[PDB]
């Protein structure tokens, strides 16, 4: 065994002694720019990933091979058309270069109504009805799939999405982007048995309405026929209008067809010294519709450089990992992490006992100043001991500048890679991002290039150094320390936040006439389990049966916050703090917000089912933290 | 092996379907290699230590837990053990639905039987990856 | 409805109206490029003579498209024409590069319209674009590539003597 | 006895009567009554087990719908 801050010096001296931007420029070379799934150059890039993992003398690399159905455009290409009734004929406004993936190959025609972003509250602020009409929105702050689900909510049949100048500072008024709108994560085309019959799916997130991207100049040409002033609340340009005229409407034609492709998730494992079966997951999206400097020029690059530095600390200097290390390069990640979900459909509840942390290399390098964290709560205090001794790149100060970092955590959306690990399979996951108030302008465009990425941030090597430093300190803290640096006492604040939501609304509970004693009994069981586990940690050893068992009990705490009360095929999102579905807790919060009025949308028997299953989930997880039956 | 013997007697019904059963026999090979390798590890086990013997003992304890089917609900069908429990996802219910194929009665559902075969093959694959443990031991 | 319309899909008329808008946009851009040089502080009269032409040809392109569209019997739904990208082209070489970029955009739009006409089984529209618009745009892109290469090899935009001799001899 | 009740319900019968035969049960008493259960499975069947009022059905257990 070596000494700890000496190994910190080893990490700090192998971070400063490795070039980072060269791989990002190498993936942007002329032989490798189209790496969309199913192509020749994507297979060549997977061969290059396999070559780079073979160059550093690792333990074992292989392919995770799957035969998946994706949806690629035909020879017929997408069309957005202004149609007028009085003269019966048309005008093409845009045949876009990009497309929203997995949309319905159909043709819709309807009155166009403009909304801000595509949320529920922005639909409830409208003037014009939504049903049977196409709504044009802007991308921002939500996914494409939540826009499609909101359009499914109010009988809308089409969604047009345009990049503005205010939110996205792009000089190109004609640049098209890429998108995916799976209501959920994975393949929506999942009647997943191999065969020639055609069964429906019906439980895998199929958008039964078309949706298609548009550019900015064609958006302005659309607003040229639209009337009604946009609000000053929505913070737009002077171009914006609300609804088309009396006899004019908008026609959308999407022409995407099936394609049977092969995905090859490149896996590389390195053994440890003591513990053979448990590991930290280090994964990275790899493909791109376009060039992919930030979408692919970052995740694959940081994956390869962490493989380089960890192979150096294994082979050269003699770092001792307590447990094994993995490196996963994913295919079909642009569609909503389809390959990761199909890997986790075979690994639903048979992986959380071994793999205990996902680190998000995807979208870690996006800007310079702001360091924002969205993570599983067990990792949080670990992140805290990460934020106090890692340098800020340009300013020079510390990263731990705000002691209110864990309460204002913006939640993970659908389009991230750590959210299926957080909500579907029950593995703790962390996502750290360098970025600013403005989003990354080239997520899914053809200009996600090495030139603009190295031009905006001259210290891209230093930003990638800080991101790889917090990732490497994550790996070394989790895989060399005698304990686990996982905080189960933030869950005290989580369950107490749920009880705090209930205490402010107890008048609506006393209208129902409930004595809530077993819920407070479950919260007392949870509190006594945390106190007794702390007392057991007061009498636990370090370098010794009991220690790995206590560590695995600490690992299981995120897994018990899934709901075991529903079926995964009907609802893949089962986590009550972060996931989605009626059995989850934010659905109960919104259904109880429906209780304060006499609206018919409030389903009271369904709300009672929500509350009973939530109380039983709290009881079961609070007893699952206790472990042995003596600890009550 | 008795499940594989129940399968080999009715592989005519599987080959009229035109599908290969490769992943189930791969999971069976992983299971038998897991038993042989854990027996070899029992050949490398001491008596009165603390670090490896109780870990091997817990790995033999967990064999009962990783036969529970992860693909059905505990609230819908509380009997998830595929060998001794009941429900449509179990292996005797698969054998009953395979018995129902021999006639043209409406009790036989094709797609539900294919669902049962797929989820049972993935359950035996998960049990094979659960008993064998490390990814070095496959 | 119409009475001469036969085997004419609506997406064809859509792309035709898009192309008519693009051609009138190109004519307006060449008008701005032409009367930019007529100022005193640039004073290249034969550049203005050249760029006042190749706007009338694109005007004839738009009018030939509209005549074709009224032959097959649709309507003509036409949008606004947008102002050009830049005005101060800073030289005469950089204006040739912007004209080159504009002609390559027009060629790209014509290739997309030909692929649309091929997908819809309209042989007359394919034949129209093969006879009229592809060959002329290839010749125009080659000619602008020649002029860009001459003004680059003559050392412009360093010494405007290159611009003066190129204006007097080639475009005279 | 719960398999008797559930299988009689599966053919849509309306009643289950269970006695003790002399051959299988060599009992001297002919007027003896016995005790049993009618739950297909284990756990509490009557579970609206949230702390409480209102009267919800079970709806997630599979209760018998005919008397025994």
UniProtKB/Swiss-Prot annotation, chain A:
It is a single-pass type II membrane protein. Keywords: Cell membrane, Disease variant, Disulfide bond, Endocytosis, Glycoprotein, Host cell receptor for virus entry, Host-virus interaction, Lipoprotein, Membrane, Palmitate, Phosphoprotein, Receptor, Secreted, Signal-anchor, Transducer, Transmembrane, Transmembrane helix. Its main location: membrane. The keyword RNA-binding does not apply. GO terms for molecular function: double-stranded RNA binding; Hsp70 protein binding; identical protein binding; protein homodimerization activity; protein kinase binding; protein-containing complex binding; RNA binding; transferrin receptor activity. Residues 446-632 are annotated as: Ligand-binding. A motif (Cell attachment site) lies at residues 523-525. It is found in: Cell membrane; Melanosome. One of its GO terms (cellular component) is extracellular exosome. Glycans are attached at residues 131, 603. Homodimer; disulfide-linked. Binds one transferrin or HFE molecule per subunit. Binds the HLA class II histocompatibility antigen, DR1. Interacts with SH3BP3. Interacts with STEAP3; facilitates TFRC endocytosis in erythroid precursor cells. Interacts with GRM2. (Microbial infection) Interacts with Guanarito, Junin and Machupo arenavirus glycoprotein complex. This is Transferrin receptor protein 1. It comes from Homo sapiens. The gene is TFRC.
Curated annotation (Swiss-Prot), chain C:
GO terms for cellular component: autolysosome; autophagosome; cytoplasm; cytosol; extracellular exosome; extracellular region; ferritin complex; ficolin-1-rich granule lumen. GO terms for biological process: immune response; intracellular iron ion homeostasis; iron ion transport; negative regulation of cell population proliferation; negative regulation of ferroptosis; negative regulation of fibroblast proliferation. SUPFAM superfamilies: Ferritin-like (SSF47240). GO terms for molecular function: ferric iron binding; ferrous iron binding; ferroxidase activity; identical protein binding; iron ion binding; iron ion sequestering activity. Its EC number is 1.16.3.1. The keyword Cytoplasm applies. The record marks 18 as: Essential for association with cargo receptor NCOA4. Expressed in the liver. Pfam families: Ferritin. Fe cation 2 binds at residues 58, 103, 137. It is found in: Cytoplasm; Lysosome; Cytoplasmic vesicle, Autophagosome. Keywords: Acetylation, Cytoplasm, Cytoplasmic vesicle, Iron, Iron storage, Lysosome, Metal-binding, Neurodegeneration, Oxidoreductase, Phosphoprotein. It catalyses: 4 Fe(2+) + O2 + 4 H(+) = 4 Fe(3+) + 2 H2O. Fe cation 1 binds at residues 23, 58, 61. Residues 6-155 form the Ferritin-like diiron domain. The keyword Nucleotide-binding does not apply. Belongs to the ferritin family. Stores iron in a soluble, non-toxic, readily available form. Important for iron homeostasis. Has ferroxidase activity. Iron is taken up in the ferrous form and deposited as ferric hydroxides after oxidation. Also plays a role in delivery of iron to cells. Mediates iron uptake in capsule cells of the developing kidney. Delivery to lysosomes is mediated by the cargo receptor NCOA4 for autophagic degradation and release of iron. Oligomer of 24 subunits. There are two types of subunits: L (light) chain and H (heavy) chain. The major chain can be light or heavy, depending on the species and tissue type. In the human liver, the heavy chain is predominant. The functional molecule forms a roughly spherical shell with a diameter of 12 nm and contains a central cavity into which the insoluble mineral iron core is deposited. Interacts with NCOA4; NCOA4 promotes targeting of the iron-binding ferritin complex to autolysosomes following starvation or iron depletion. It is linked to Hemochromatosis 5: A disorder of iron metabolism characterized by iron overload. Excess iron is deposited in a variety of organs leading to their failure, and resulting in serious illnesses including cirrhosis, hepatomas, diabetes, cardiomyopathy, arthritis, and hypogonadotropic hypogonadism. Severe effects of the disease usually do not appear until after decades of progressive iron loading. This is Ferritin heavy chain.
């Amino acid at each position: 065994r070596l000494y700890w801050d000496d190994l910190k010096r080893k990490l700090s001296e192998k971070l400063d002694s490795t070039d980072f931007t060269s791989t990002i420029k190498l993936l942007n070379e002329n032989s490798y720019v189209p790496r969309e799934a199913g192509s020749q150059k994507d297979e060549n890039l997977a061969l290059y990933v396999e070559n780079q993992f073979r160059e550093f003398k690792l333990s074992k690399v292989w392919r995770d091979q799957h035969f998946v159905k994706i949806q690629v455009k035909d020879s017929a290409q997408n069309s957005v058309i202004i149609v007028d009734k009085n003269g019966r004929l048309v005008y093409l406004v845009e045949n876009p270069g990009g497309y929203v993936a997995y949309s319905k190959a159909a043709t819709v025609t309807g009155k166009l109504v403009h909304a801000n972003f595509g949320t529920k509250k922005d639909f409830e602020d409208l003037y014009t009805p939504v049903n049977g009409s196409i709504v044009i929105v802007r991308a921002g702050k939500i996914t494409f799939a939540e826009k499609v689900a909101n359009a499914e909510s109010l009988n809308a049949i089409g969604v047009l999405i345009y990049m503005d100048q205010t939110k996205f500072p792009i000089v190109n008024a004609e640049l098209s982007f890429f998108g995916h709108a799976h209501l959920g994560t994975g393949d929506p085309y999942t009647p997943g048995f191999p065969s020639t019959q055609f069964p429906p799916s019906r439980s895998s997130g199929l958008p039964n309405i078309p949706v298609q991207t548009i550019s900015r100049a064609a958006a302005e040409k659309l607003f040229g026929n639209m009337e009604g002033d946009c609000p000053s609340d929505w913070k737009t340009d002077s171009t914006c209008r609300m609804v088309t005229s009396e006899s004019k409407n908008v026609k959308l034609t999407v022409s995407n067809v099936l394609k049977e492709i092969k995905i090859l998730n490149i896996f590389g494992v390195i053994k440890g010294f003591v513990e053979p079966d448990h590991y930290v997951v280090v994964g990275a999206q790899r493909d791109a519709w376009g060039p992919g400097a930030a979408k692919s020029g970052v995740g694959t690059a940081l994956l390869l450089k962490l493989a380089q530095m960890f192979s150096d600390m294994v082979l050269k200097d003699g770092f001792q990992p307590s447990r094994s290390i993995i490196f996963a390069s994913w295919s079909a990640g642009d569609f909503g992490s389809v390959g990761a979900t199909e890997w986790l459909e075979g690994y639903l509840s048979s992986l959380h006992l071994k793999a205990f942390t996902y680190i998000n290399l995807d979208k870690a390098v996006l800007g310079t100043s702001n360091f924002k964290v969205s993570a599983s709560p067990l990792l949080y205090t670990l992140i805290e001991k990460t934020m106090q001794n890692v340098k800020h790149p340009v300013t020079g100060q510390f990263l731990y500048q705000d002691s209110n970092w864990a309460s204002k955590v913006e939640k993970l959306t659908l389009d991230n890679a750590a959210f299926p690990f957080l909500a579907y399979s029950g593995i703790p996951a962390v996502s750290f991002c360098f970025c600013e108030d403005t989003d990354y302008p080239y997520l899914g465009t053809t200009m996600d290039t090495y030139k603009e990425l190295i031009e905006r941030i001259p210290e891209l090597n230093k930003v990638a150094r800080a991101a790889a430093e917090v990732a490497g300190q994550f790996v070394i803290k989790l895989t060399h320390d005698v304990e686990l640096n996982l905080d189960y006492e933030r869950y005290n604040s989580q369950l107490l936040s749920f009880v705090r939501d209930l205490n402010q609304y107890r008048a609506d509970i006393k209208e129902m006439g409930l004595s809530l004693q077993w819920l407070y009994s479950a919260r007392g069981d949870f509190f006594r389990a945390t106190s007794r586990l702390t007392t057991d940690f007061g009498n636990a050893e370090k370098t010794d049966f009991v220690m790995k068992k206590l560590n695995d009990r600490v690992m299981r705490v995120e897994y018990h916050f899934l709901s075991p009360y529903v079926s995964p095929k009907e609802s893949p999102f089962r986590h009550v703090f972060w996931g989605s579905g009626s059995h989850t807790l934010p659905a109960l919060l919104e259904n109880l917000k429906l209780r304060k009025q006499n609206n018919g949308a409030f389903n009271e028997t369904l709300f009672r089912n929500q509350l009973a299953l939530a109380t039983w989930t709290i009881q079961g997880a609070a007893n699952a933290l206790s472990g042995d039956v003596w600890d009550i | 092996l008795s499940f594989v013997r129940d399968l080999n007697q009715y592989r005519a019904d599987i080959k009229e379907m035109g599908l290969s059963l490769q992943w189930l026999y791969s999971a069976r090979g992983d299971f038998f290699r897991a038993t042989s390798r854990l027996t070899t590890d029992f050949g490398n086990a001491e008596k009165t230590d603390r670090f490896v013997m109780k870990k091997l003992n817990d790995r033999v304890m967990r064999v009962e837990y990783h036969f529970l089917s992860p693909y059905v609900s505990p609230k819908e069908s509380p009997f998830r053990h595929v060998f001794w429990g009941s429900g449509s996802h179990t292996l005797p219910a698969l054998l009953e639905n395979l018995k129902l194929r021999k006639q043209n009665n409406g009790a036989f559902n094709e797609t539900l039987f294919r669902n049962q075969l797929a989820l049972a093959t993935w359950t035996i694959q998960g049990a094979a990856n659960a008993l064998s443990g490390d990814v070095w031991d496959i | 409805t119409s009475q001469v319309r036969q085997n004419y899909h609506q997406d064809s008329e859509a792309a035709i109206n898009r192309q008519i808008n693009l051609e009138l946009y190109a004519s307006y851009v060449y008008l701005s490029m032409s009367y930019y040089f007529d100022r005193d502080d640039v004073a290249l009269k034969n550049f203005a003579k050249y760029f006042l032409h190749q706007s009338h040809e694109e005007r004839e392109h738009a009018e030939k498209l509209m005549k074709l569209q009224n032959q097959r019997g649709g309507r003509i739904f036409l949008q606004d024409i947008k102002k050009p990208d830049c005005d101060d082209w800073e030289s005469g070489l950089n204006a040739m590069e912007c004209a080159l970029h504009l002609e390559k955009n027009v060629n790209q739009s014509l290739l997309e319209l030909h692929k649309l006409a091929t997908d819809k089984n309209d042989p007359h529209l394919c034949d129209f674009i093969e006879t009229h618009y592809l060959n002329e745009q290839v010749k125009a892109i080659k000619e602008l590539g020649d002029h860009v290469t001459n003004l680059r090899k003559m050392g412009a935009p360093e010494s405007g003597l290159a611009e003066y001799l190129f204006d007097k001899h080639t475009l005279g």
